[PDB]
Coordinates of C-alpha atoms and ligand atoms in Angstrom, one line a residue:
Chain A
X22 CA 72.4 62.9 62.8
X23 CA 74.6 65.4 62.6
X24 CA 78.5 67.1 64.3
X25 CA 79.8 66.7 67.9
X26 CA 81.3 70.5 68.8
X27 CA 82.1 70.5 72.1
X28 CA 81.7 67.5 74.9
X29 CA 80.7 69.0 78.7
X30 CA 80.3 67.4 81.7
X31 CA 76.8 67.7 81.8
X32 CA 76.2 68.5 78.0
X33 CA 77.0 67.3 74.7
X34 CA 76.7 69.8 72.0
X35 CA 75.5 68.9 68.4
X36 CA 75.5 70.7 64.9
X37 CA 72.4 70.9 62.2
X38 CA 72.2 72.0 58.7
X39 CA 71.4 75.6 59.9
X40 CA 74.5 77.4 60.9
X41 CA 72.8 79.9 63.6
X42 CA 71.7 76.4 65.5
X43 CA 72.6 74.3 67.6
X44 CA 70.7 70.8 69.5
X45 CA 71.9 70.2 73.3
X46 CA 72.0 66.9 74.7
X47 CA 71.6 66.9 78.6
X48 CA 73.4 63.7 79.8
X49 CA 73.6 61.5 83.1
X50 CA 76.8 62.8 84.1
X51 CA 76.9 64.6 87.4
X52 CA 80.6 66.1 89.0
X53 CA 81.1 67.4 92.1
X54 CA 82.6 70.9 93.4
X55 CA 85.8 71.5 91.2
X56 CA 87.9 68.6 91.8
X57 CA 85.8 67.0 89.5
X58 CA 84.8 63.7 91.4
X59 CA 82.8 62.0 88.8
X60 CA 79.2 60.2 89.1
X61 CA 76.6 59.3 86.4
X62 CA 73.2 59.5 87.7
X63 CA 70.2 57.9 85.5
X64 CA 67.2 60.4 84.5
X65 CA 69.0 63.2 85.3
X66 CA 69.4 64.2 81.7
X67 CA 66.0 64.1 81.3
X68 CA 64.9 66.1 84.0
X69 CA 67.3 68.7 83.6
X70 CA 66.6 69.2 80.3
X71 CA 62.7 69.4 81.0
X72 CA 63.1 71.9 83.7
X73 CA 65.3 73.9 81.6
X74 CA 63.7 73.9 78.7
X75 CA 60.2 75.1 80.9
X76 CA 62.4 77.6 82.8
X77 CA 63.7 79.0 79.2
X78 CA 60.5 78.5 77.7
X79 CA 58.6 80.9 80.4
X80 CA 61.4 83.4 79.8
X81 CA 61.0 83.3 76.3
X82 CA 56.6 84.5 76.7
X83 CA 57.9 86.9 79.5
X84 CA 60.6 88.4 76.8
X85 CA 63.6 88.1 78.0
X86 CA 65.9 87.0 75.3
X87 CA 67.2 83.4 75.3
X88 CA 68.8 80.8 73.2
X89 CA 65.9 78.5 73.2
X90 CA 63.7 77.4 70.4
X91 CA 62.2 74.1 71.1
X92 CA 62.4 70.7 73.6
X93 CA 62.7 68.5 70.6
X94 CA 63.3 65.5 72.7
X95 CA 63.7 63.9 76.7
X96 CA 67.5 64.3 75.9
X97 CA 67.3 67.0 73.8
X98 CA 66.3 71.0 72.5
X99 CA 67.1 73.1 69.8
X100 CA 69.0 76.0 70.9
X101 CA 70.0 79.2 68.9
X102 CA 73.9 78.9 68.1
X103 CA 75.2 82.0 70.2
X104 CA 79.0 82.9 70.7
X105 CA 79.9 82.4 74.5
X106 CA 80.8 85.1 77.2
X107 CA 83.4 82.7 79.2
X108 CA 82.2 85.1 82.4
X109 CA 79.7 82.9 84.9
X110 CA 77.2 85.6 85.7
X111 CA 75.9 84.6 89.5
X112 CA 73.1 86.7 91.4
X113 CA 72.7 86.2 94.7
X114 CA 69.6 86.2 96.7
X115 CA 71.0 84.3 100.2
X116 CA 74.0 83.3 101.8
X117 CA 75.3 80.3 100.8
X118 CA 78.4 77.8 99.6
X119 CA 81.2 80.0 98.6
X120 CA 79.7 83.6 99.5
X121 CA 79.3 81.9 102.9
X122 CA 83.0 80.6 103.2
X123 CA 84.2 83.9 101.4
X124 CA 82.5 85.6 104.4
X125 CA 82.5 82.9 107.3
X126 CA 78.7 83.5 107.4
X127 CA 76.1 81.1 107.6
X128 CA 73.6 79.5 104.9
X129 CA 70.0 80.8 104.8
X130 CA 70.7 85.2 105.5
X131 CA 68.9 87.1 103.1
X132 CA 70.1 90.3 101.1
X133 CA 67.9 92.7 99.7
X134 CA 69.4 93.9 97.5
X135 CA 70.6 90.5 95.6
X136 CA 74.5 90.6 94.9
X137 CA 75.7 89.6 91.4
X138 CA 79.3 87.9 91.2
X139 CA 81.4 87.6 87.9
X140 CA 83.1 83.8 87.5
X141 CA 85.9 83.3 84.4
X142 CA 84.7 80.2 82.4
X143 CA 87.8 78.8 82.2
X144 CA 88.3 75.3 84.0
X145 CA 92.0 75.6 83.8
X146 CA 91.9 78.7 85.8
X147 CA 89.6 76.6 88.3
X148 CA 86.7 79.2 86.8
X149 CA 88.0 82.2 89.1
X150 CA 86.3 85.1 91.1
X151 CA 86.6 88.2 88.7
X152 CA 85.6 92.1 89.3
X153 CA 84.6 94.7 86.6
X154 CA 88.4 95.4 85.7
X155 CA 89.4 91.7 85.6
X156 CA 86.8 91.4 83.1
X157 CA 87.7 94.2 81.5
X158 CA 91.2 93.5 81.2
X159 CA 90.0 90.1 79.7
X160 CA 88.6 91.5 76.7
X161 CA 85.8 89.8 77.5
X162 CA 83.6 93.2 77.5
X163 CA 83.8 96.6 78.8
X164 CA 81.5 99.1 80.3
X165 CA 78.1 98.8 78.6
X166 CA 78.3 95.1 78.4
X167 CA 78.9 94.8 81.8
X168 CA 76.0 96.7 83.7
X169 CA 73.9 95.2 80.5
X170 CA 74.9 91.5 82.0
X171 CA 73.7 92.8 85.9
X172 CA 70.8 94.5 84.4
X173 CA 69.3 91.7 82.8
X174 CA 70.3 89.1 85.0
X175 CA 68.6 91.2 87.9
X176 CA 65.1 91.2 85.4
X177 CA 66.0 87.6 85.3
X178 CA 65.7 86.9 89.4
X179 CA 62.6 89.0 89.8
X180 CA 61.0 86.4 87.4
X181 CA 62.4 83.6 88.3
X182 CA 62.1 84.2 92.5
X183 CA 58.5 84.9 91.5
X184 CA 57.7 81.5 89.9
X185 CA 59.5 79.8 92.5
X186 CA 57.9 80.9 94.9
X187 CA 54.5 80.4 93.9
X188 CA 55.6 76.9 93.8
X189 CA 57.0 77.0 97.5
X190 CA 60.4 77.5 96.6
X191 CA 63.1 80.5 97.7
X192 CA 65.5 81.1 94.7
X193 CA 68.5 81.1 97.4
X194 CA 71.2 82.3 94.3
X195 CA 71.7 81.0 90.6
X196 CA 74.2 81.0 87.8
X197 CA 73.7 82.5 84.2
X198 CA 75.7 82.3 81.1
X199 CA 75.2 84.3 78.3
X200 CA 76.4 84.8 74.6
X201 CA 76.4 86.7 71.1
X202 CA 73.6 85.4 68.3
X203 CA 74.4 85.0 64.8
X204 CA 73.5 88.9 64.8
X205 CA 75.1 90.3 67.6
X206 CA 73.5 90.6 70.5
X207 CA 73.9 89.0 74.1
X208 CA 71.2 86.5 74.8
X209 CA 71.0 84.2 78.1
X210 CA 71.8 80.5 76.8
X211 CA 73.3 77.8 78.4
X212 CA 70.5 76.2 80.8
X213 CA 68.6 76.7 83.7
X214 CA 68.3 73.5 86.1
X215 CA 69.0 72.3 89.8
X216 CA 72.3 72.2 88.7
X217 CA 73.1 75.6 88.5
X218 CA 70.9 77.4 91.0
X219 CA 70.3 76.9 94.9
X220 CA 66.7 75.8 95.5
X221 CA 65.8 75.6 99.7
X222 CA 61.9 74.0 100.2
X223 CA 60.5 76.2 102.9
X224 CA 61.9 74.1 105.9
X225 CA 65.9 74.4 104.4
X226 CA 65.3 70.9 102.3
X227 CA 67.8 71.4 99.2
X228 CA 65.7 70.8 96.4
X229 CA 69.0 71.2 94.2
X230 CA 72.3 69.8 93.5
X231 CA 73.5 70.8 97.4
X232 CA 72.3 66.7 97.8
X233 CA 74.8 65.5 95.0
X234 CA 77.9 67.2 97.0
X235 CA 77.0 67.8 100.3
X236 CA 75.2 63.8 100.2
X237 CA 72.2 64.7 101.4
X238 CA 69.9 62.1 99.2
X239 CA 69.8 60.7 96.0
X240 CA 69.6 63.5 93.2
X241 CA 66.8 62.5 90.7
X242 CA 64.6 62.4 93.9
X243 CA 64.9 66.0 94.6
X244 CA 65.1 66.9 90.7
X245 CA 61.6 65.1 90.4
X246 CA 60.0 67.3 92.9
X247 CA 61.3 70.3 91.2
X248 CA 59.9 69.4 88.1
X249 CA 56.6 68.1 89.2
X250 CA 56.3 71.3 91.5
X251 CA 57.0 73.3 88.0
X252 CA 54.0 72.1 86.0
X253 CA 52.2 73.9 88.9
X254 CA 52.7 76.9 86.5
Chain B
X21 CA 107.9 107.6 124.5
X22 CA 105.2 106.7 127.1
X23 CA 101.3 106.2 126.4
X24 CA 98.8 103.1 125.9
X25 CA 97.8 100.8 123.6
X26 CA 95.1 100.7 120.6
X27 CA 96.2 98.1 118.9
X28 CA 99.0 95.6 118.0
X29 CA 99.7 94.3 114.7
X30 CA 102.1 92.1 113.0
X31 CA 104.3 95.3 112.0
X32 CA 103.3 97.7 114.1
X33 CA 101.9 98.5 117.7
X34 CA 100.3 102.1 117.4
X35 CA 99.9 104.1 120.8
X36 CA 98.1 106.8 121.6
X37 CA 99.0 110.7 123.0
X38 CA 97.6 113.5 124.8
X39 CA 96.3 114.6 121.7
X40 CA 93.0 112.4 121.0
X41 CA 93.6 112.9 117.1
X42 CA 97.5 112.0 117.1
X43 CA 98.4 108.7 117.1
X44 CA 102.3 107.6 117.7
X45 CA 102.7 104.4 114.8
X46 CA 105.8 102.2 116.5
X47 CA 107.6 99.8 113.6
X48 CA 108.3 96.5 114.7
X49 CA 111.1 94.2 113.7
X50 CA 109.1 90.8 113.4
X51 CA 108.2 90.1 109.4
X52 CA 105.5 87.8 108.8
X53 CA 104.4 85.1 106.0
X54 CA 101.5 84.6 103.9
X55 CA 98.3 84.0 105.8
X56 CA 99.9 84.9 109.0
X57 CA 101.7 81.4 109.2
X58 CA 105.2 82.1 108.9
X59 CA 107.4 85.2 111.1
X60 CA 110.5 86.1 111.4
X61 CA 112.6 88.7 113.9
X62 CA 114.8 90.5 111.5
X63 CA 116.7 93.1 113.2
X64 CA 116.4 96.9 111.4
X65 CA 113.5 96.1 109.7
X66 CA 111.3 98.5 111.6
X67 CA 113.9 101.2 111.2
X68 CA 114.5 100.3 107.7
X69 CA 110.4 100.6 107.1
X70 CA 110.2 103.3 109.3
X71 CA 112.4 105.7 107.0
X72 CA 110.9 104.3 103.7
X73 CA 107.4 104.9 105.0
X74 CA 108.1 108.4 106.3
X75 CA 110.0 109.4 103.0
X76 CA 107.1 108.8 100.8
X77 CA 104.3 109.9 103.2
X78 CA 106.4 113.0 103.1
X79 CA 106.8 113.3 99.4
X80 CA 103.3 112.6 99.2
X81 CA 102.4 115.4 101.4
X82 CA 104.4 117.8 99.3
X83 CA 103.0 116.5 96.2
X84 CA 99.0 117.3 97.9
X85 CA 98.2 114.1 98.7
X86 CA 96.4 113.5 102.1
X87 CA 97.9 111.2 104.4
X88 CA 97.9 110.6 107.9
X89 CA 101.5 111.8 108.1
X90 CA 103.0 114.4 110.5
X91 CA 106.7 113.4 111.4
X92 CA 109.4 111.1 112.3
X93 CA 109.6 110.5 116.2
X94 CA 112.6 108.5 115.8
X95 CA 114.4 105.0 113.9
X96 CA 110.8 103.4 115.5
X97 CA 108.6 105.8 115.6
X98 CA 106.4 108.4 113.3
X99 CA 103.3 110.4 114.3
X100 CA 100.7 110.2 112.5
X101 CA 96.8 111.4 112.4
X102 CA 94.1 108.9 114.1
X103 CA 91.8 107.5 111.5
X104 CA 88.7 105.2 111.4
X105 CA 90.2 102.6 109.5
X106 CA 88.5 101.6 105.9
X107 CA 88.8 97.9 106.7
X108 CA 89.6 97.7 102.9
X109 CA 93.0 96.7 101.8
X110 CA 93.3 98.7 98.3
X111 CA 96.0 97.1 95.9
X112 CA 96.6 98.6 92.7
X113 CA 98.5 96.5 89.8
X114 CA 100.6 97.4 87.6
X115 CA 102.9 94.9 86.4
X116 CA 101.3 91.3 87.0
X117 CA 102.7 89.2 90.1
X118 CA 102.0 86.9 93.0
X119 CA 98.2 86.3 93.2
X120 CA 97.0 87.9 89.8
X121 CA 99.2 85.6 88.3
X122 CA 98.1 82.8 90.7
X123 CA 94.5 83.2 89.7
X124 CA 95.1 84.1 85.9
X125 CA 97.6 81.9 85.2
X126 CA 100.2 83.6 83.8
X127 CA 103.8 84.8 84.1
X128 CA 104.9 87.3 86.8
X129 CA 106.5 90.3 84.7
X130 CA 103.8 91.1 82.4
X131 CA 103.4 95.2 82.0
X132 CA 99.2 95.7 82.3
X133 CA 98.0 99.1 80.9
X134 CA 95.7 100.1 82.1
X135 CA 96.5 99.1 85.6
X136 CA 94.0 97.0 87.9
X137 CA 92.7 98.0 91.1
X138 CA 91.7 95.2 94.0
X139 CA 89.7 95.5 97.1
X140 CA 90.5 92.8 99.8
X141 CA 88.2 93.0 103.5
X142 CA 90.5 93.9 106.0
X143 CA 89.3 90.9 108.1
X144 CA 91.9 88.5 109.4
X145 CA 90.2 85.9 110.3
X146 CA 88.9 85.7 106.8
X147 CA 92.4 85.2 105.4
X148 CA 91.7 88.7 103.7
X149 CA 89.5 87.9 101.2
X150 CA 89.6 89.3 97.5
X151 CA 86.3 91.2 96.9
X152 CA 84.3 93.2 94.2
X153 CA 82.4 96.5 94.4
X154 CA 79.0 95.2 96.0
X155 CA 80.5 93.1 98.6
X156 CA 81.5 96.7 99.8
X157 CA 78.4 97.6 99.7
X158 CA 77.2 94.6 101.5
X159 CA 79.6 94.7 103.9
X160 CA 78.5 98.5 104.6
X161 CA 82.2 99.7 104.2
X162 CA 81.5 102.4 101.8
X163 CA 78.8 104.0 99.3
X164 CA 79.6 104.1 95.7
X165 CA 80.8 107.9 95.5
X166 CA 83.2 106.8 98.3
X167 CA 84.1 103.8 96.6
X168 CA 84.7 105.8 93.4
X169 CA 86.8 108.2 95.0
X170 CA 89.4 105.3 96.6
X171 CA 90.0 104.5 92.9
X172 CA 90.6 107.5 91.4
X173 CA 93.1 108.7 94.6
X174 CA 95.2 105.0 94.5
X175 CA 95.4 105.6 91.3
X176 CA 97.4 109.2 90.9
X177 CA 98.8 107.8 93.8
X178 CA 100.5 105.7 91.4
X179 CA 101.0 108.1 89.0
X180 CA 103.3 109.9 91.5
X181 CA 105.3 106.5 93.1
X182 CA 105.6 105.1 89.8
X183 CA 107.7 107.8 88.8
X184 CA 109.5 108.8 91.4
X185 CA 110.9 104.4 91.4
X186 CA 111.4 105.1 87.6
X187 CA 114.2 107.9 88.5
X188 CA 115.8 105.8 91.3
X189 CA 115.4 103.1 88.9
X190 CA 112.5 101.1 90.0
X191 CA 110.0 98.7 89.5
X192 CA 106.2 99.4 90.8
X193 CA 105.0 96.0 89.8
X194 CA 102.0 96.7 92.8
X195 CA 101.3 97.9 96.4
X196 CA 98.9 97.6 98.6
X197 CA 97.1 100.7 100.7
X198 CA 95.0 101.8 103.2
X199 CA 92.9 104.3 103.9
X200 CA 90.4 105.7 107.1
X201 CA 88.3 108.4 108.0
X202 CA 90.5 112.0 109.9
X203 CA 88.6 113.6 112.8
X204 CA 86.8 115.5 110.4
X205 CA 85.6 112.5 108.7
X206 CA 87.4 113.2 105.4
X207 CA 89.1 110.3 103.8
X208 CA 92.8 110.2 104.1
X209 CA 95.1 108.3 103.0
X210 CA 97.2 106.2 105.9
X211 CA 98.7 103.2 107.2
X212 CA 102.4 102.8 105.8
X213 CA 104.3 102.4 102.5
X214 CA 106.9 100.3 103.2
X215 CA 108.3 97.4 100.8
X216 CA 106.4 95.1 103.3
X217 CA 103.5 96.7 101.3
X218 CA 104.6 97.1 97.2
X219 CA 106.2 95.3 94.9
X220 CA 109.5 96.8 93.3
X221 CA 111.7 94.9 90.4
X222 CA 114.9 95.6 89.8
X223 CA 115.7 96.1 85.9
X224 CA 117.6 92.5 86.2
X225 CA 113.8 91.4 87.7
X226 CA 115.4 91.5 90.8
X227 CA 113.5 91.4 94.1
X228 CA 113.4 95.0 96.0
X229 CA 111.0 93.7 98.7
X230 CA 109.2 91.1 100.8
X231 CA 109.2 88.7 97.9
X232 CA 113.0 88.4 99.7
X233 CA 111.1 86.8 102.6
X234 CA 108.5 84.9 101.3
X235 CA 110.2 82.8 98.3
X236 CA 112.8 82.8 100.6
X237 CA 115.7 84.8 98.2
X238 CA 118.2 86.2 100.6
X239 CA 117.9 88.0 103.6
X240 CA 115.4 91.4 103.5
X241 CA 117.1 94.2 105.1
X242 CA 119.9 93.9 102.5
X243 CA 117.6 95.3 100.2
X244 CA 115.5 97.2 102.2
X245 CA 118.1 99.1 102.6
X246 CA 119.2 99.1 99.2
X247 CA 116.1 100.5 98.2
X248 CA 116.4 103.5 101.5
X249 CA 119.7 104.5 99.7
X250 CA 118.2 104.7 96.4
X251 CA 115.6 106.8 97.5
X252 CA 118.3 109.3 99.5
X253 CA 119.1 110.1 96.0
X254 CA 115.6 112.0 95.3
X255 CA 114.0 115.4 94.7
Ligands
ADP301 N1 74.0 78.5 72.3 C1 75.2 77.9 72.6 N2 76.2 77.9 71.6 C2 77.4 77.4 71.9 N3 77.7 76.8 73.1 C3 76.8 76.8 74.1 C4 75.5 77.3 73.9 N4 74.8 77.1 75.1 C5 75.7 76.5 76.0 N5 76.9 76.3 75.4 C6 78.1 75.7 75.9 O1 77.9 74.3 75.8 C7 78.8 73.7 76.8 C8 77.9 72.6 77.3 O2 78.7 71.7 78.2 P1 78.5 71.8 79.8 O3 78.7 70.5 80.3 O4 77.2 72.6 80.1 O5 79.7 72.8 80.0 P2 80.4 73.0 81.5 O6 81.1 71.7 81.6 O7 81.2 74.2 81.3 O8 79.2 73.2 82.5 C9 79.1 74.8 77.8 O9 80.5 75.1 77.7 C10 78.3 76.0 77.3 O10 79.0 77.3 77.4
ADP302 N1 96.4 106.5 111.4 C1 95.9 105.3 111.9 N2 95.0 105.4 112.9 C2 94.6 104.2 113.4 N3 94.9 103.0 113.0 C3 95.7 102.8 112.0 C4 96.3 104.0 111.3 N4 97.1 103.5 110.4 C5 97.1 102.2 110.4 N5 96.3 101.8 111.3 C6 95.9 100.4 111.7 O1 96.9 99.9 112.7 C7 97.2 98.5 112.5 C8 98.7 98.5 112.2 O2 99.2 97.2 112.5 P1 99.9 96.5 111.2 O3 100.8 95.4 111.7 O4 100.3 97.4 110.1 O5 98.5 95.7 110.8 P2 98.5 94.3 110.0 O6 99.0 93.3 111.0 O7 97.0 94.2 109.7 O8 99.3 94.6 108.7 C9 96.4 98.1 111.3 O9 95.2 97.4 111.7 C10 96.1 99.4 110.5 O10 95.0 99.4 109.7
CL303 CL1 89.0 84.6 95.4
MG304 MG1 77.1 74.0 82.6
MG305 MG1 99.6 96.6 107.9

């Protein structure tokens, strides 16, 4: 028992008695593209916070920096308290969604190399397209900070593609967001689940939250997969 | 004036000559709105553009900036050197406006310092697109020391128009360029600068420009030509 910070649409984030942390609560909600179009979807907390807390976990033994600690329950882990960088960090891996419609392209075209796209965390702004300068101009960061967000979150998809693909599973693009410790430094937080990454089974099946928007199934189905596939590692 | 066609535009119809680098740029009198959807005829407008466009090119010149300029044919017409358009449309901000304040969410009329620089694909069908550095890359448009050096030229390009609207009392809020590859293969800065392409305030905030056209202010070649006098009174 302890303080409500800030309420998400798929998170809930609580205090502790230690400043520097922080427990996340994964919850049932799930929202479409933007115009929020709101559904809540049972287990989904659950999984989501499994898978993310495995993904994190494996980061954490591979040493890449992260806000995790511990899964301390289905609904919930213990997360380092970190500052947030309101800048989405996306690499991309394949056409898809909104690179696609940016470039009238189709879904499923490799790159090689992967492209990395900056997003303003702000949902008032509808969580814009931003270059280098844009960010800059923010205040959000300047040089240095930057190339160090592309540079780790470049060491972050040759991981993860790895592992996913040992587990039949192309990491088509993801979505990062990352934030300042109690001392300092930037540090990949946030979570890492179907939610926020594209996930295509080797015949195009969306293992991924493409099936919440685009309607192709029901989402715990495809979620359950994922996660089962996972403990393959 | 009699030779084929290369391509027709919304503004301008560029023909060809007997010399396979020189390219005759003609300056239509059709003005056109937002993603295409809207156009106008407005009689002058070419002529108006044509002169605007030609005076700065010149300028430019003088002050050792590249450019694709050679002369004025006539009220329609300038020559100009045949490039391999950079299908890159380069805007460079220095006030914020328009879409930077669509996407951002503030007030047009905000000064920025340092001012921001904004690639967009040259790619109709795409409505233009905004894009960043490696969708450049992707799109095979340009290498990084190319990419670099589009920068660093749009911006003591501003340096230069900036000024030269401060003495004639004039806003820069933006523009918008374009440049392509000379018969040499050296990058050269082209296309036109017309207030089609730029944004310029008035001191009262008033509208020197296109803005006229699309929100629909008044009727544009009043102050396009206000804006051709004002620069007469240059150098
Ligand atoms: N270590 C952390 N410290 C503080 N905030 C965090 C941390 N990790 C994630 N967050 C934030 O918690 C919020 C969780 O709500 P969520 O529903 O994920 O947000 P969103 O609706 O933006 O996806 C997010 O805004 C995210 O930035
Ligand atoms: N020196 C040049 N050589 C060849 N093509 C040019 C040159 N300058 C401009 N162009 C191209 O000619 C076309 C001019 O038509 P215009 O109406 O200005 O185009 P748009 O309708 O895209 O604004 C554009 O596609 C432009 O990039
Ligand atoms: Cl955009
Ligand atoms: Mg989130
Ligand atoms: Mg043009």
């Amino acid at each position: 028992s302890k303080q409500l910070i800030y309420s998400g649409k798929a998170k809930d984030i609580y205090t502790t008695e230690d400043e520097n942390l922080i427990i996340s609560t994964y919850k049932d909600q799930a929202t479409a593209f933007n115009g929020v179009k709101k559904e809540q979807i049972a287990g989904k907390g659950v999984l989501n916070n499994q898978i993310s807390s495995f993904i994190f976990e494996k980061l954490n033994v591979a040493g890449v920096a992260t806000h995790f600690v511990e899964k301390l329950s289905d609904t919930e882990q213990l997360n380092k308290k970190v500052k947030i960088i309101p800048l989405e960090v996306v690499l991309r891996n394949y056409t898809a969604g909104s690179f696609s419609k940016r470039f009238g392209v189709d879904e499923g075209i490799a790159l090689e190399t992967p492209i990395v796209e900056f997003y303003y965390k702000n949902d008032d702004l509808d969580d814009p397209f931003i270059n280098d300068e844009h960010v800059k101009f923010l205040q959000i960061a300047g040089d240095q900070q930057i190339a160090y967000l592309k540079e780790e979150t470049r060491r972050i998809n040759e991981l993860l593609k790895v592992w996913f693909a040992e587990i039949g599973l192309k990491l088509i693009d993801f979505k990062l967001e990352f934030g300042f410790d109690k001392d300092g430094k930037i540090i990949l937080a946030d979570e890492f689940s179907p939610d926020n990454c594209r996930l295509w089974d080797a015949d195009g099946n969306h293992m991924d939250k493409d099936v919440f928007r685009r309607g192709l199934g029901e989402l715990t189905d495809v979620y359950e997969i994922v996660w089962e596939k996972l403990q393959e590692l």
